Amino acid sequence: IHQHRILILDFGSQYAQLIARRVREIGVYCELMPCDIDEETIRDFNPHGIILSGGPEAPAFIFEIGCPVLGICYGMQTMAYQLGGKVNEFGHAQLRVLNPAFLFDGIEDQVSPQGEPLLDVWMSHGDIVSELPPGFEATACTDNSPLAAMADFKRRFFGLQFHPEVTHTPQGHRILAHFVIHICQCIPNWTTKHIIEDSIRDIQEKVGKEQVIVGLSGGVDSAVTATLVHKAIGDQLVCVLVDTGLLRLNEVDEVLNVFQKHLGAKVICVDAKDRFMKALKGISDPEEKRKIAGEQFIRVFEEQAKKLNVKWLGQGTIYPDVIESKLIEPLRELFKDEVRKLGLELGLPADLIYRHPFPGPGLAIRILGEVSAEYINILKQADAIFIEELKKSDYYHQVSQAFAVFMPLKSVYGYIIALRAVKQWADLPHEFLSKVSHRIVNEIKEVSRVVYDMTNKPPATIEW
Amino acid sequence: IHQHRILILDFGSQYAQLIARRVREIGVYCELMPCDIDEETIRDFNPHGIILSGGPEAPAFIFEIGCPVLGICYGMQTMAYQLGGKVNEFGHAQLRVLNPAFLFDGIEDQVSPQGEPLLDVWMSHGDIVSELPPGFEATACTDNSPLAAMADFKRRFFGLQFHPEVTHTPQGHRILAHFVIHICQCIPNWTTKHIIEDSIRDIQEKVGKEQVIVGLSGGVDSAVTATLVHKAIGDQLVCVLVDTGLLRLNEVDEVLNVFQKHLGAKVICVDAKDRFMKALKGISDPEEKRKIAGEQFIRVFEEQAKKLNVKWLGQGTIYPDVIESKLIEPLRELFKDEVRKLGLELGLPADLIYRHPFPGPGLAIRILGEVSAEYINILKQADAIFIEELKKSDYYHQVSQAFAVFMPLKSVYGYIIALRAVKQWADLPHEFLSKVSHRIVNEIKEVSRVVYDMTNKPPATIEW
């Protein structure tokens, strides 16, 4: 496995990760490297094909290497500049195909009165190409853009002025599948079952007969590491679960049911609850909260291990956190979709797999001021109530994330709770919200009044 | 004028006031006293009839006076208990009338398969009466209550197990009108025109040729007081408008336009802004904030006057203010309904009359922490934007009250703004709220994020 692979160069752009994800969905391995990376890397990666992406809001020698190249938006611009030819805002556009090529064979959204194939696409209007380089030809155009797609054919270089990754070009996934499977000639073996097997073999070859600790604390990625490791080395896995005090009401219990009661597993419970409240005893700065919690986390995991004489630590590091810039990281090449797909296949329960993300520092965010315990206990209840409804009204999975935050401000007196749910804040029904607010204030004394965040992904962050 | 009058005894109950208001709408004066008030008062008030309200969530000798007496809910119970007879949850209930009497003559919601009159009423299921007193006969029943209404006729005592004041007994106002107009034999002379004339005369009688200071700061109550005085004594009126710094963005301008520019009127403007900020420099406690404002407000008014040599101060005190327990107070027997009706007839512009209530201490509340000036200037911007929309979307007059509040906390970093809108928090559309919030965070820098209060009148207080 791994032997068929696509290199994606990142020129910025939200959608770089997502080119990669679409490629993994097609069934082929790929890595996402920044464009400032050097030849050697790229040479030693020796890809079947390269995809240039991006531009937010020069790559060099990759046209010498034998493989095919696909430039997306800005990727098309520099592909133009760096070969011959001249060069110089996002929306839907109706693209018209001239030469259905290799990259567009089939692939039609409409046919048009004149009998020409048309694609609905999400254009990047600013990444314009004025004149074609030598060897290229117009393979697609739009009313406002004479050359919205390029193609060499002899060198197998291709350009698009739109984003095929995004759902707003419906047939985009087929276009990418045509590049990867047909033009780059990759056979799909990046499967899930094949990932599970490759990963078990890796864990076995690296760890041998000696023990591994995995922190159950941490949601889907941890659960997947623990089970993945468990399957690889059985009794050698020793699970540790630290109650930092910063976890959701029933997390400790829910986790123990899965790993201890079901499926055997040695699980060590560490208290750490008093430890974490000290160390955060002052500390209002939310950036210093994140440091202290997390430092104190790795410390606890080092103490356990420098105690059970364990040399290896298993972490749930995934690929997105890798690309943001003695351990065993089984998921470090995987995106979140994939971890979820592995999770189901490994035998974890659905409700754990598709649970809302939970931050690393946990509830140490979600309290605005100093974190205290007096405060976590009352936050735990409002949050519990909030997600209990949602579950009872099947609204839970219609939102991407949902939680309560605690403001230590007080009103007519008692503290204020803020509710956060997004999808782009979620348009939940009045009467339902009322029932959630009504309950939080009534059941939890020492509160009075709850509020709902109405601020979107662009202007404000999801977490406070 | 005042020559016909109803006494209302208050035994607790949201709807005590409201009986009063209904009686006032019918055109008859009335006062609201607590049930524990003494004989003498009552004698001195010399009513033409009495209404007993009450029961939240034993008056004595009132039955000795020749005047009629109506008991609502608990009022019916105590009336029963204090005469002969025995006694012992609120909802809709279909009342069947036996004997249309004087109190139900006409007044039918539905007839009935047996040809008998039926009323939709809003029962108090708990204030039951087991056995009629001497002189009384059952005058109405429901499936669950054999005697939901009582009547003496000889003594003109009447009881109801339901609330006629409330909108959920649609015919209730007619029943009250029948008591006040027909049984108590009163004449509806409490008209707004007569109140204006009696009030102008009362001012003239009291103040004669000497001058009066009226504060223009204070919305509808102030405005009406000032116009009323202006009509009474012309150039003798001297208006004072103090800008405390706790007033809304354009309030100074709007009042000056109506009083200084339109309709002559001597208006003195006082700066007071530095003064109020000093007074409230520390002081987080919102009970103290309320106290320091108001104190400082009265002080400012005494200094003017003890300077212009004026001996009379006019105020917008209204009857609800009097109820909760050298000056001229013309509005002190009126409810808000009536003050608004007056202002309109007196020539004040509609948009001032039906303006949302603004609190006495103003923007001193609505900043949670210590009021700073740096914080009011942020809040003024937030508030302004909020109501500008609403005006634009015609949602302003579909809510009873709307305002912003400033929380000095900060999130991912700038301060947080809560928005409050009620009528029972306002079910405004997702599209519209999003517009407001986007605008508050983009236009006011140093904000970031904004929330919305989802808490009702029963659990949380309207204002913070």
Short mmCIF file of N, CA and C in Angstrom, two decimals, chain B residues 180-293:
data_model
loop_
_atom_site.label_atom_id
_atom_site.label_comp_id
_atom_site.label_asym_id
_atom_site.label_seq_id
_atom_site.Cartn_x
_atom_site.Cartn_y
_atom_site.Cartn_z
N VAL B 180 -69.99 48.07 37.26
CA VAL B 180 -69.68 49.47 37.50
C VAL B 180 -70.76 50.42 36.99
N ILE B 181 -71.33 50.15 35.83
CA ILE B 181 -72.29 51.08 35.23
C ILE B 181 -73.71 50.87 35.74
N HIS B 182 -74.14 49.61 35.87
CA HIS B 182 -75.55 49.32 36.13
C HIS B 182 -75.86 49.02 37.59
N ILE B 183 -75.05 48.17 38.21
CA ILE B 183 -75.26 47.77 39.60
C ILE B 183 -74.80 48.85 40.58
N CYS B 184 -73.61 49.41 40.34
CA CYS B 184 -73.11 50.53 41.14
C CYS B 184 -73.63 51.88 40.64
N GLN B 185 -74.28 51.88 39.48
CA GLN B 185 -75.03 53.05 39.03
C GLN B 185 -74.13 54.25 38.69
N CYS B 186 -72.86 53.99 38.40
CA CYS B 186 -71.89 55.05 38.08
C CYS B 186 -72.04 55.55 36.66
N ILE B 187 -71.55 56.76 36.42
CA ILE B 187 -71.59 57.41 35.11
C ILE B 187 -70.17 57.55 34.58
N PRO B 188 -69.96 57.20 33.30
CA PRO B 188 -68.60 57.18 32.78
C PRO B 188 -68.09 58.58 32.42
N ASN B 189 -67.57 59.29 33.42
CA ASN B 189 -67.05 60.65 33.22
C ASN B 189 -65.52 60.73 33.20
N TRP B 190 -64.85 59.63 33.53
CA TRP B 190 -63.40 59.56 33.46
C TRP B 190 -62.99 59.44 31.99
N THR B 191 -62.99 60.58 31.31
CA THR B 191 -62.61 60.70 29.90
C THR B 191 -61.30 61.42 29.87
N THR B 192 -60.54 61.30 28.78
CA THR B 192 -59.23 61.94 28.73
C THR B 192 -59.40 63.45 28.64
N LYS B 193 -60.42 63.92 27.94
CA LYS B 193 -60.69 65.36 27.83
C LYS B 193 -60.95 66.01 29.18
N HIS B 194 -61.74 65.34 30.01
CA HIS B 194 -62.04 65.82 31.34
C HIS B 194 -60.82 65.75 32.25
N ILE B 195 -59.99 64.72 32.10
CA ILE B 195 -58.75 64.65 32.89
C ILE B 195 -57.82 65.82 32.55
N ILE B 196 -57.72 66.17 31.27
CA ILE B 196 -56.90 67.29 30.85
C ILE B 196 -57.41 68.58 31.48
N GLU B 197 -58.72 68.77 31.51
CA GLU B 197 -59.27 70.02 32.04
C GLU B 197 -59.18 70.11 33.55
N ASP B 198 -59.53 69.04 34.25
CA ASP B 198 -59.39 69.00 35.70
C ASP B 198 -57.94 69.22 36.10
N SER B 199 -57.03 68.66 35.32
CA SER B 199 -55.61 68.73 35.63
C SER B 199 -55.02 70.12 35.40
N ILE B 200 -55.40 70.78 34.31
CA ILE B 200 -54.96 72.15 34.06
C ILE B 200 -55.44 73.07 35.17
N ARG B 201 -56.67 72.85 35.60
CA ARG B 201 -57.27 73.66 36.64
C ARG B 201 -56.55 73.41 37.95
N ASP B 202 -56.24 72.15 38.24
CA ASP B 202 -55.54 71.82 39.48
C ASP B 202 -54.16 72.49 39.55
N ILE B 203 -53.46 72.55 38.42
CA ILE B 203 -52.15 73.19 38.35
C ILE B 203 -52.28 74.69 38.59
N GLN B 204 -53.24 75.31 37.91
CA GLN B 204 -53.50 76.74 38.06
C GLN B 204 -53.85 77.09 39.50
N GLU B 205 -54.71 76.29 40.12
CA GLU B 205 -55.11 76.50 41.51
C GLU B 205 -53.90 76.47 42.44
N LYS B 206 -52.99 75.54 42.18
CA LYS B 206 -51.86 75.30 43.07
C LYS B 206 -50.73 76.29 42.89
N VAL B 207 -50.37 76.54 41.64
CA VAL B 207 -49.16 77.30 41.36
C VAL B 207 -49.42 78.80 41.14
N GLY B 208 -50.65 79.16 40.79
CA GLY B 208 -50.97 80.55 40.50
C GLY B 208 -49.99 81.21 39.55
N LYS B 209 -49.48 82.36 39.95
CA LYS B 209 -48.64 83.16 39.07
C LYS B 209 -47.15 82.76 39.09
N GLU B 210 -46.75 81.86 39.99
CA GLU B 210 -45.33 81.53 40.12
C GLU B 210 -44.88 80.39 39.22
N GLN B 211 -43.57 80.28 39.05
CA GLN B 211 -42.97 79.44 38.01
C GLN B 211 -42.78 78.00 38.42
N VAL B 212 -42.64 77.13 37.42
CA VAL B 212 -42.45 75.71 37.64
C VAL B 212 -41.32 75.16 36.76
N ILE B 213 -40.47 74.33 37.36
CA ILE B 213 -39.44 73.61 36.65
C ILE B 213 -39.99 72.24 36.39
N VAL B 214 -39.91 71.78 35.14
CA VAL B 214 -40.23 70.41 34.79
C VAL B 214 -39.03 69.78 34.09
N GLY B 215 -38.66 68.58 34.51
CA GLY B 215 -37.58 67.85 33.88
C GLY B 215 -38.07 67.24 32.58
N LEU B 216 -37.36 67.49 31.49
CA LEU B 216 -37.71 66.90 30.20
C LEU B 216 -37.07 65.54 30.04
N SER B 217 -35.97 65.31 30.74
CA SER B 217 -35.35 63.99 30.78
C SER B 217 -36.37 63.05 31.41
N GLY B 218 -36.75 61.99 30.71
CA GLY B 218 -37.67 60.98 31.29
C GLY B 218 -38.84 60.50 30.43
N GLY B 219 -38.69 60.58 29.10
CA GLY B 219 -39.64 60.00 28.17
C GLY B 219 -41.06 60.50 28.33
N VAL B 220 -42.01 59.59 28.12
CA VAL B 220 -43.42 59.94 27.93
C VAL B 220 -44.04 60.65 29.13
N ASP B 221 -43.74 60.18 30.33
CA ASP B 221 -44.30 60.76 31.55
C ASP B 221 -43.88 62.21 31.71
N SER B 222 -42.59 62.49 31.52
CA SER B 222 -42.07 63.86 31.58
C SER B 222 -42.74 64.74 30.54
N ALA B 223 -42.69 64.29 29.28
CA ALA B 223 -43.23 65.05 28.16
C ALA B 223 -44.65 65.51 28.42
N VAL B 224 -45.51 64.56 28.82
CA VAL B 224 -46.90 64.87 29.11
C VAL B 224 -47.01 65.85 30.26
N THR B 225 -46.22 65.67 31.31
CA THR B 225 -46.22 66.60 32.43
C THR B 225 -45.90 68.02 31.98
N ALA B 226 -44.92 68.14 31.08
CA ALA B 226 -44.41 69.45 30.65
C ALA B 226 -45.40 70.17 29.75
N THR B 227 -46.01 69.43 28.82
CA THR B 227 -47.01 70.01 27.94
C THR B 227 -48.22 70.44 28.75
N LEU B 228 -48.59 69.60 29.72
CA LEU B 228 -49.77 69.83 30.55
C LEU B 228 -49.58 71.12 31.33
N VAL B 229 -48.40 71.28 31.91
CA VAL B 229 -48.05 72.50 32.64
C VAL B 229 -47.96 73.70 31.69
N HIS B 230 -47.31 73.51 30.55
CA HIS B 230 -47.20 74.55 29.55
C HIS B 230 -48.55 75.13 29.17
N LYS B 231 -49.53 74.26 28.94
CA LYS B 231 -50.90 74.70 28.64
C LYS B 231 -51.56 75.40 29.81
N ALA B 232 -51.15 75.06 31.03
CA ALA B 232 -51.76 75.60 32.24
C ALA B 232 -51.26 76.99 32.56
N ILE B 233 -49.95 77.22 32.42
CA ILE B 233 -49.32 78.45 32.91
C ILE B 233 -48.36 79.15 31.92
N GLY B 234 -48.37 78.74 30.65
CA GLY B 234 -47.61 79.42 29.60
C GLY B 234 -46.15 79.67 29.94
N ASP B 235 -45.74 80.94 29.86
CA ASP B 235 -44.34 81.35 30.06
C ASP B 235 -43.82 81.06 31.46
N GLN B 236 -44.71 80.79 32.42
CA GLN B 236 -44.28 80.42 33.77
C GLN B 236 -43.52 79.09 33.79
N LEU B 237 -43.79 78.21 32.82
CA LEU B 237 -43.07 76.95 32.72
C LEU B 237 -41.64 77.19 32.27
N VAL B 238 -40.70 76.58 32.98
CA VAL B 238 -39.32 76.56 32.56
C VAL B 238 -38.88 75.09 32.57
N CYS B 239 -38.59 74.58 31.38
CA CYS B 239 -38.14 73.21 31.23
C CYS B 239 -36.66 73.09 31.54
N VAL B 240 -36.26 71.98 32.14
CA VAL B 240 -34.86 71.68 32.30
C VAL B 240 -34.57 70.30 31.72
N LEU B 241 -33.53 70.22 30.90
CA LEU B 241 -33.11 68.99 30.29
C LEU B 241 -31.68 68.74 30.72
N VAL B 242 -31.45 67.76 31.59
CA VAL B 242 -30.09 67.44 32.00
C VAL B 242 -29.59 66.23 31.20
N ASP B 243 -28.42 66.38 30.58
CA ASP B 243 -27.78 65.28 29.88
C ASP B 243 -26.86 64.61 30.87
N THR B 244 -27.33 63.53 31.47
CA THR B 244 -26.55 62.81 32.46
C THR B 244 -25.42 62.01 31.84
N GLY B 245 -25.53 61.75 30.54
CA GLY B 245 -24.64 60.82 29.85
C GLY B 245 -25.22 59.42 29.80
N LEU B 246 -26.32 59.21 30.51
CA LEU B 246 -26.99 57.92 30.59
C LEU B 246 -28.21 57.88 29.68
N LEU B 247 -28.28 58.78 28.69
CA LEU B 247 -29.46 58.85 27.82
C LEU B 247 -29.12 58.32 26.45
N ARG B 248 -30.15 57.97 25.69
CA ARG B 248 -29.93 57.37 24.38
C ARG B 248 -29.36 58.36 23.38
N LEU B 249 -28.75 57.82 22.33
CA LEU B 249 -27.94 58.59 21.39
C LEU B 249 -28.56 59.95 21.02
N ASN B 250 -29.83 59.94 20.62
CA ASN B 250 -30.49 61.13 20.07
C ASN B 250 -31.52 61.74 21.00
N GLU B 251 -31.58 61.31 22.25
CA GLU B 251 -32.71 61.70 23.12
C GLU B 251 -32.73 63.20 23.36
N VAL B 252 -31.56 63.78 23.66
CA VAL B 252 -31.44 65.22 23.83
C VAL B 252 -32.04 65.92 22.61
N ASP B 253 -31.53 65.59 21.42
CA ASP B 253 -31.98 66.23 20.18
C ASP B 253 -33.50 66.14 20.01
N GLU B 254 -34.04 64.95 20.18
CA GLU B 254 -35.46 64.70 19.92
C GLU B 254 -36.37 65.46 20.87
N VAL B 255 -35.95 65.63 22.11
CA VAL B 255 -36.77 66.35 23.08
C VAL B 255 -36.69 67.84 22.82
N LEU B 256 -35.49 68.34 22.54
CA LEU B 256 -35.33 69.76 22.20
C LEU B 256 -36.15 70.13 20.97
N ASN B 257 -36.19 69.24 19.98
CA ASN B 257 -36.95 69.49 18.75
C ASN B 257 -38.42 69.65 19.05
N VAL B 258 -38.94 68.78 19.91
CA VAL B 258 -40.35 68.83 20.27
C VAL B 258 -40.66 69.97 21.24
N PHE B 259 -39.77 70.29 22.18
CA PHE B 259 -40.08 71.33 23.18
C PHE B 259 -39.50 72.72 22.91
N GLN B 260 -38.27 72.80 22.43
CA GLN B 260 -37.64 74.09 22.18
C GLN B 260 -38.06 74.65 20.82
N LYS B 261 -37.95 73.84 19.77
CA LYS B 261 -38.18 74.30 18.40
C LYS B 261 -39.66 74.33 18.03
N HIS B 262 -40.36 73.23 18.26
CA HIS B 262 -41.80 73.15 18.03
C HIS B 262 -42.47 73.48 19.35
N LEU B 263 -43.32 74.49 19.38
CA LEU B 263 -43.95 74.92 20.64
C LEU B 263 -42.98 75.63 21.57
N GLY B 264 -42.57 76.84 21.18
CA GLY B 264 -41.87 77.79 22.05
C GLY B 264 -41.08 77.18 23.17
N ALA B 265 -41.52 77.37 24.41
CA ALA B 265 -40.99 76.66 25.59
C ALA B 265 -39.55 77.00 25.99
N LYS B 266 -39.40 77.61 27.16
CA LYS B 266 -38.09 77.93 27.71
C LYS B 266 -37.46 76.63 28.16
N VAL B 267 -36.38 76.22 27.50
CA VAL B 267 -35.69 74.99 27.86
C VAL B 267 -34.23 75.28 28.17
N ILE B 268 -33.84 74.97 29.40
CA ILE B 268 -32.47 75.12 29.87
C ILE B 268 -31.81 73.76 29.78
N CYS B 269 -30.65 73.69 29.15
CA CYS B 269 -29.90 72.45 29.05
C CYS B 269 -28.75 72.47 30.05
N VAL B 270 -28.56 71.35 30.74
CA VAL B 270 -27.51 71.22 31.74
C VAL B 270 -26.60 70.06 31.37
N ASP B 271 -25.28 70.27 31.50
CA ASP B 271 -24.28 69.30 31.03
C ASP B 271 -24.20 68.06 31.90
N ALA B 272 -23.94 68.20 33.19
CA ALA B 272 -24.09 67.07 34.15
C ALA B 272 -23.33 65.75 33.84
N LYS B 273 -22.65 65.68 32.71
CA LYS B 273 -22.12 64.42 32.20
C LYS B 273 -20.89 63.98 33.00
N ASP B 274 -19.91 64.87 33.10
CA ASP B 274 -18.76 64.67 33.99
C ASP B 274 -19.21 64.39 35.42
N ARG B 275 -20.28 65.05 35.85
CA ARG B 275 -20.78 64.89 37.21
C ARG B 275 -21.24 63.46 37.50
N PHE B 276 -22.08 62.92 36.62
CA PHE B 276 -22.61 61.57 36.80
C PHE B 276 -21.56 60.48 36.70
N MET B 277 -20.55 60.69 35.86
CA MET B 277 -19.48 59.70 35.71
C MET B 277 -18.62 59.63 36.97
N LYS B 278 -18.33 60.78 37.56
CA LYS B 278 -17.61 60.81 38.83
C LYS B 278 -18.39 60.10 39.93
N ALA B 279 -19.66 60.45 40.07
CA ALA B 279 -20.52 59.86 41.10
C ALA B 279 -20.55 58.34 41.04
N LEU B 280 -20.51 57.80 39.83
CA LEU B 280 -20.61 56.36 39.61
C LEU B 280 -19.28 55.72 39.22
N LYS B 281 -18.15 56.27 39.67
CA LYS B 281 -16.85 55.82 39.15
C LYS B 281 -16.54 54.37 39.52
N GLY B 282 -16.59 54.05 40.81
CA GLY B 282 -16.55 52.66 41.27
C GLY B 282 -17.96 52.09 41.11
N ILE B 283 -18.46 51.41 42.14
CA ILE B 283 -19.88 51.07 42.22
C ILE B 283 -20.36 50.07 41.16
N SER B 284 -20.04 48.80 41.38
CA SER B 284 -20.58 47.71 40.58
C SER B 284 -22.00 47.38 41.03
N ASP B 285 -22.24 47.42 42.33
CA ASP B 285 -23.52 47.03 42.90
C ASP B 285 -24.63 47.80 42.20
N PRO B 286 -25.56 47.08 41.54
CA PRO B 286 -26.60 47.72 40.75
C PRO B 286 -27.70 48.40 41.58
N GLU B 287 -27.80 48.05 42.86
CA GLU B 287 -28.75 48.71 43.75
C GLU B 287 -28.21 50.09 44.11
N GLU B 288 -26.89 50.18 44.32
CA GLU B 288 -26.22 51.46 44.55
C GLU B 288 -26.21 52.33 43.30
N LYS B 289 -25.88 51.75 42.15
CA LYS B 289 -25.92 52.50 40.90
C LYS B 289 -27.26 53.20 40.77
N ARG B 290 -28.33 52.46 40.99
CA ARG B 290 -29.69 53.02 41.00
C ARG B 290 -29.82 54.16 41.98
N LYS B 291 -29.19 54.02 43.14
CA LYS B 291 -29.31 55.01 44.21
C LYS B 291 -28.49 56.27 43.91
N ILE B 292 -27.26 56.10 43.44
CA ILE B 292 -26.38 57.24 43.14
C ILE B 292 -26.96 58.09 42.02
N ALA B 293 -27.36 57.45 40.93
CA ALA B 293 -28.26 58.10 39.97
C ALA B 293 -29.50 58.41 40.78
#
